[PDB]
Design a protein around this nucleic acid. Structure first.
Lengths: 79, 93, 51, 95, 54, 104, 115, 95, 79
DNA sequence: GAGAATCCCGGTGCCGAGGCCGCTCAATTGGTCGTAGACAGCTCTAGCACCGCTTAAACGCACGTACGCGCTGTCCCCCGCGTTTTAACCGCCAAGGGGATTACTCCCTAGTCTCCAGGCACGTGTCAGATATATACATCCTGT
DNA sequence: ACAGGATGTATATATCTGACACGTGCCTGGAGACTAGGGAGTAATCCCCTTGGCGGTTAAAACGCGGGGGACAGCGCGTACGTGCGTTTAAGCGGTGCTAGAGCTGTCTACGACCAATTGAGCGGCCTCGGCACCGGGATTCTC
C-alpha cells in the first residue's frame, strides 16, 4: 500500500490524457516503475540542492532548478 | 605558446602502461575530454555559487557539483580522492 | 591510543581505504561501510573528532 | 444497450478541453514523503514544491503516453503493451 | 498572441490555458519553447483519424 | 621553491587550472581548495579512461592507443557511457550488435 | 488432452511411489532440492561476479567482445550468447526459485542470526 | 555458393568490424559548397571542417539506422519503410 | 546533379554499418532529404559564426561549436 | 425514435485584479583615465584550380524468393456500468521549526613585484615493414 | 589419369625506406612575499509557514460481471527488393602554381569602469469592485 497511493483511475486518466483508447490490463507495474525512477531522480537532485543551501526542507525553487538542470524546465513557480 | 595537456596524461599513462603509445587523434580525444569536463564542472560550480548569494567559489561548491555531474560510483570515488588530496595539501606543516 | 571500530564500538582491526572508517570484520564492512550514503561517514568520524 | 469505444472518445473530449489536476494531493504527497526518506531523514516540504512535482510528473506521463500511442498505431494496433513502452523509452533515449 | 487567443475564447481575462494554445498553435514559438512545460494549461486537442471510428 | 602539485601529491598542474578558473569569469572570488579539488577529479577521470584504453589496446594485441580502443573502452563501461552518452567520437566506429531474430 | 492425461498418469505414479516408498522418494526429492539450491547458488555467484568490473569474468567478456571487434554458425551462436541478460537472469532465477519450491513440495509430500 | 542471407551477415559483420569512411569525399565537398553559397557566396572551407561534417553525418545516419531498425522489429518486420523513418524522427523529437 | 551526388550503395554501406538487413527502394531520397536538412541546420550556425569572425574561411572551430550547441558535440577536431 | 449528455443562458456570490500611496535604494548625471579595441601594415600558411589516369565503384539489369501486406478465425481481455468501501477534501486552530534579517569580528583572497623553470617549437635516431636473392622440395593445375 | 612446368614455402640472409620515437633551446606564466579591503563566519532574534489532527462529507476508488471489438496466429497472392553480373563514370591522386586572407604587430584613441551626488521609479501594502467561478433550468445534438 506504499506505492499503491496512485491507482487505476489516476493512470486511466493519465493515459486518456495521452489520447489512448484501449489500454492493457497489466500495464500497471512498468508505469509504477518509471514513476518511481522519475521522482527519485528529481528529488535526489532537489535534496542535493537543498543540502548545499543548508535548508533542510525542500523548496519549490530547488525543484524547478532541478528540472532546468534536467532539461524539463517549468514556468510559473519561480525562476 | 599553444597550451595543451599532453605531458601530464603522458606520465599518468606511463605509470601503469609503460610499453604503450598514443596516437595524435587519440591525444586530441583526451585533450578535448579534459577541457569538456573542466567546462561542465566549472559552470555548474559557478551556477551553484550564484545560487546562494555567494560571491566566492570554494571546495564545497565543487564537491556538490561533482556529486551532481558524475554517476554514483564515479562520484563517491572522485570525492574520496579529492578529499584525500585536499587534506594532503592543507596539512603542509 | 586504542583503535576501535566506528560502527560497533568493538576492537577495530581494519580501516577502509575510501572513507577512513575503522570496522570490525567482513560483514560489518559489506553491510555498512561499502554501501553507505555519501555524507554519513563524516559524523561517524565526528564522534572521535576526525572529520 | 450500449457500444464500447464511443463513450471512450466521448470522455476523451470531456477531459480534453478541461485542464484540471488529475491525481489527488494526499497519496502522491505521501509517496513523495516516503521517496525522500532514504536520502535525508526528518525532511519537510512546502505546498508549492509538491505542486511542481505533480505538474512535472503529469507532463512526463502525457509526453510518454501519446508517443507510445503513436508507437501502438504504427504497428497497426490500438491496445498498448510492454514492448510499445520499451520502444518509446528506447526511441526517446533514456537508455 | 495571448490577446488573440483570449478574444476567440469569450473571455476578457488571459488564462494560462489560452496562451498555452497560443504557443502550441504558432510554430515559431512552438520550437522556440519546445523543451519547456507550462502551468495547468493542459494539451491542445487533436484526434488521429484511425482512432475516429466509422 | 616547489610547485603545489607535488605538495598535494598530483601530476596535473594546480596553478594552471587556478589561472583558467580566474579569468574564466565564473566568479570574482575563488578559494584555495578549488584548484586542488578540480585537479584531483581530473586526475581520477584521466587515470580511469587511460586504464580502460590500455586494457582495450592490449586486448587488440597492438602496442599503441587507437581511437577504436577509446570507443571500446567508452561504450563497454557502464557509467562512462552514461557520462559520455552525448558526445560523438572521432574515428571510433560502432560496437558490434546484432538483434537476436536476425540470426536464423 | 494427451499431455494432460500423461501429466495425470505421472501424478498417479508419483502418488503410488510416495505411498509405496516415502523414504526413498523423500531422499530423491531432497537430493533434487539440494541440486537445485546448488545451481541457484552458482547462478547467484555468477551474477555477483559479473557485476565486478575488475573481476576476471569482465576481462574475459571484454576479450570476447574485442575478439568480435578486432579480427560461421557457431561463432554466430557465440555472438548471440554474449548478449546482456539483466532481466533474463532475473526470469531464470524466478524459474529456479519455482523449481526449488516444487522440489521442497515434493520433499514435503514424500542465514542463522546467531552467527 | 551460399544461401541468401549468409553473405549479407558476412558483409554486415565486415562493415561493423571496420572504421573507414563510407561517403565519397568530392560529392560531399560539392554538396557542402552548393548548400553554403545560398547563405553566403564565395566562401572558403577547411579540410578538417569537411572531415567534421563527414563524421557528424556518419554518426547521425548510423544512429538513425539503429532506431529505424528498432522500428522495423517493433512492427514485426525486417525491411524498413518510410513510416519507420517518420516514426523514428517523431519519437526522437524533431519534425 | 549534386543532391544525389552522394550515392545509393554508399547509403547501403552506412545502413549496413547500422545493422539493418533489408532496405526499401523508397528510402534513398528521404535519407537524402534528412541529410540535406541536417547540413542546412549545421552550416547556418557555422556561417553565422564565420560571419561574426570577420572571416571568409570556415574553420574547424566554427563547425565544432555549431554541433556542440545542438547537443551533438564531437571530440578530436576541437584541438 | 429514446436517452443521455454536452452547450446555452440567466442569475448570483465572491475574491483576486487593478488602482492608489508611502518612500527607499537604485538610475542618472558628471568627470578621470587606464586600456581594450580599431585599424593600418605585413608574413606566409594554406585553400583554390586543375591536367590527366587507374579503377573501384556506381550504374544498369536480369532472376527469384523472403517478405510486405491483405484476409481471416478464434481466444480473450479490457470496456461499461452498478454497487460498495474508503480515504481525499475541506474547515481550521495551533506549536514551533527554521529561514530572514541583523549585527559584527576576522580570516581570506585580490593585487603587485620579482623571477625561474616547466613546458612548447623544433631539431635528431630507431626498429617495423617492405622488398629482394637463392636452392632446393612441395604442390597444383593443366594438357596430353 | 599422370607428368611437367608453373608458383609456393621455407629459412636463412641481404639492402632500404616509413612512421614512430627521443632530445634540446628558450620564454612566459607559476611561485613566493606581502598588504589590506571585504566577503564570509557566526550569534541573536523576529515571526511565516509548515506540520497534526480532531471529524464530516461524498465524490472517487474497488470489485465484479456480461460481452464484443480487438490481438494475434495462421494463411496466401504477389511484388518489391536481394543477389549476381556487365557496362560505365567520375571518385581518388598527386603535381603544383596563384594568391586570399588568416594571423601577428605596432600605434592611436575613443570607449567604458569607477567614484560621487541624488531623486523618483518602482516595490510593499491597502482597498473597491467586476469577471469569472458557481449554479441551475432547459435547448440541443450524438448515439444505438
Amino acid at each position: 500500500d506504499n506505492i499503491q497511493g496512485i491507482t487505476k483511475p489516476a493512470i486511466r486518466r493519465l493515459a486518456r490524457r495521452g489520447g489512448v483508447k484501449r489500454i492493457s490490463g497489466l500495464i500497471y507495474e512498468e508505469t509504477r516503475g518509471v514513476l518511481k525512477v522519475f521522482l527519485e531522480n528529481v528529488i535526489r537532485d532537489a535534496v542535493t540542492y537543498t543540502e548545499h543551501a543548508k535548508r533542510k526542507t525542500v523548496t519549490a525553487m530547488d525543484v524547478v532548478y532541478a528540472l532546468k538542470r534536467q532539461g524539463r524546465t517549468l514556468y510559473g513557480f519561480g525562476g | 605558446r599553444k597550451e595543451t595537456y599532453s605531458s601530464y596524461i603522458y606520465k599518468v599513462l606511463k605509470q601503469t602502461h609503460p610499453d604503450t603509445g598514443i596516437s595524435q587523434k587519440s591525444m586530441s580525444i583526451l585533450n578535448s575530454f579534459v577541457n569538456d569536463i573542466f567546462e561542465r564542472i566549472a559552470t555548474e560550480a559557478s551556477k551553484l555559487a550564484a545560487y546562494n548569494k555567494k560571491s566566492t567559489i570554494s571546495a564545497r561548491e565543487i564537491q556538490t557539483a561533482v556529486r551532481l555531474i558524475l554517476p554514483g560510483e564515479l562520484a563517491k570515488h572522485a570525492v574520496s580522492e579529492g578529499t584525500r588530496a585536499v587534506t594532503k595539501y592543507s596539512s603542509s606543516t | 591510543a586504542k583503535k576501535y571500530c566506528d560502527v560497533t564500538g568493538l576492537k577495530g582491526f581494519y580501516k577502509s581505504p575510501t572513507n577512513n572508517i575503522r570496522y570490525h570484520n567482513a560483514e560489518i564492512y559489506q553491510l555498512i561501510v561499502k554501501p553507505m550514503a555519501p555524507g554519513v561517514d563524516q559524523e561517524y568520524l565526528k564522534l572521535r573528532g576526525a572529520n | 444497450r450500449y457500444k464500447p469505444g464511443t463513450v471512450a472518445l466521448r470522455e476523451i473530449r470531456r477531459f480534453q478541453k478541461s485542464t484540471e489536476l488529475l491525481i489527488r494531493k494526499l497519496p502522491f504527497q505521501r509517496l513523495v514523503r516516503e521517496i525522500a526518506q532514504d536520502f535525508k531523514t526528518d525532511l519537510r516540504f512546502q505546498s508549492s514544491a509538491i505542486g511542481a512535482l505533480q505538474e512535472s510528473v503529469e507532463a512526463y506521463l502525457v509526453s510518454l503516453f501519446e508517443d507510445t500511442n503513436l508507437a501502438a498505431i504504427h504497428a497497426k494496433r490500438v491496445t498498448i503493451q510492454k514492448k510499445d513502452i520499451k520502444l518509446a523509452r528506447r526511441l526517446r533515449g533514456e537508455r | 498572441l495571448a490577446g488573440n487567443a483570449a478574444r476567440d475564447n469569450k473571455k476578457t481575462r488571459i488564462i494560462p490555458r489560452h496562451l498555452q494554445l497560443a504557443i502550441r498553435n504558432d510554430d515559431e514559438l512552438n520550437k522556440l519553447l519546445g523543451n519547456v512545460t507550462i502551468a495547468q494549461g493542459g494539451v491542445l486537442p487533436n484526434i488521429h483519424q484511425n482512432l475516429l471510428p466509422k | 621553491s616547489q610547485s603545489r602539485s607535488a605538495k598535494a601529491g598530483l601530476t596535473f598542474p594546480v596553478g594552471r587550472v587556478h589561472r583558467l578558473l580566474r579569468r574564466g569569469n565564473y566568479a570574482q572570488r575563488i578559494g584555495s581548495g578549488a584548484p586542488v579539488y578540480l585537479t584531483a577529479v581530473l586526475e581520477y577521470l584521466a587515470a580511469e579512461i587511460l586504464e580502460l584504453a590500455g586494457n582495450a589496446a592490449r586486448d587488440n594485441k597492438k602496442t599503441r592507443i587507437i581511437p577504436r580502443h577509446l570507443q571500446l573502452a567508452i561504450r563497454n563501461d557502464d557509467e562512462l557511457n552514461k557520462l559520455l552518452g552525448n558526445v560523438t567520437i572521432a574515428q571510433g566506429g560502432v560496437l558490434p550488435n546484432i538483434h537476436q531474430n536476425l540470426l536464423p | 488432452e494427451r499431455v494432460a492425461k500423461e501429466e495425470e498418469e505421472k501424478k498417479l505414479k508419483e502418488q503410488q511411489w510416495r505411498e509405496t516408498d516415502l523414504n526413498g522418494w523423500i531422499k530423491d526429492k531432497r537430493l533434487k532440492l539440494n541440486k537445485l539450491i546448488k545451481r541457484r547458488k552458482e547462478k547467484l555467484k555468477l551474477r555477483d561476479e559479473m557485476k565486478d568490473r575488475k573481476s576476471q569474468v569482465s576481462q574475459n567478456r571484454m576479450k570476447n567482445l574485442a575478439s568480435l571487434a578486432e579480427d560461421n554458425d557457431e561463432d554466430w551462436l557465440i555472438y548471440t550468447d554474449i548478449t546482456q541478460n539483466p532481466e533474463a537472469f532475473e526470469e531464470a532465477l524466478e524459474y529456479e526459485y519455482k523449481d526449488i519450491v516444487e522440489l521442497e513440495r515434493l520433499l514435503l509430500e514424500h542465514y542463522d542470526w546467531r552467527n
